[PDB]
Amino acid sequence: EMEKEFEQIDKSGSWAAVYQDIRHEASDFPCRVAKLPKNKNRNRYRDVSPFDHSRIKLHQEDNDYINASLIKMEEAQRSYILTQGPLPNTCGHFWEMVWEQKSRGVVMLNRVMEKGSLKCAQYWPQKEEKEMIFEDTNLKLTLISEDIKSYYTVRQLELENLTTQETREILHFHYTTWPDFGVPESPASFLNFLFKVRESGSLSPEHGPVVVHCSAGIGRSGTFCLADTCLLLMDKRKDPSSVDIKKVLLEMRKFRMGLIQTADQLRFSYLAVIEGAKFIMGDS
Ligand SMILES: [Mg+2]
């Protein structure tokens, strides 16, 4: 059982030790496309790269590279794209990926400025009347509406493929209160955020995989996917205490390196899942 395991690690203060076992056992696959010199400026961080086997490919012919990985959770029937926060020069690639992969939601878990540095380009419009045009990928993006809440903001966006003149509606879920340092004191607002994403239909299989990102696409982004998949497996399985968070994390790390960047984040993910188990083991 998982609450038990949490108690044992916390009383022992051995989160750092558990976290290292995961690092040592984590997969390593080649990242050759990402390290090509032609792609050095498509990567925000030199030590965070997509494996070649799970990388998302753009349908461009000159350069198909974007720092983005497809995570396929086959038992849970969930797929996610994890990516870095766009760079000033990759905003057009980012929306091209969203278009090509038929995604319906974008989950953003960082602020554009954190700790006094820029963690992400401003890649969506801020006013209805000032749309954005990505000339390189021939896409137009318009803010349709914006619902600001205390812990998160939901935006409706219209993405128009200027070449074909087709349009789709994208939902942008922006969690705005992740603290600059550490992790949230309680998982309550995180879980409420996660269930709003679920309720929107963005995680469902009639759509392309949801795009999740922070700054590197591995820390907070990993916490989000890990919690969603764990909670889904608890629904599906005959034995809900047969779900091992550590096993699930290692399976996801076959698809992108480094998911969950700190022992604090690991602790927090346990907390989110354990608390979330209450509201899906039958609390209407
Ligand atoms: Mg206005």
Numbering used by the authors: 2 to 285
Excerpt from the publication:
As such, there has been substantial interest in the development of PTP1B inhibitors for the treatment of obesity. By combining these complementary structural biology experiments for multiple variants, we characterize an inherent allosteric network in PTP1B that differs from previously reported allosteric inhibitor–driven mechanisms mediated by catalytic loop motions.
The locations of others, such as I19V in the α2′ helix and P302Q in the Pro-rich region immediately C-terminal to the allosteric α7 helix, do not correlate with previously known allosteric mechanisms for PTP1B, indicating that further biophysical investigations would be needed. Compared with WT, D245G and Q78R significantly decreased catalysis in vitro, consistent with them having the most extensive LOF effects in cells. Somewhat surprisingly, I19V also decreased catalysis in vitro, despite having no statistically significant effects in cells. For I19V, IADDAT difference features span the mutation site, central β sheet, and active-site P loop.
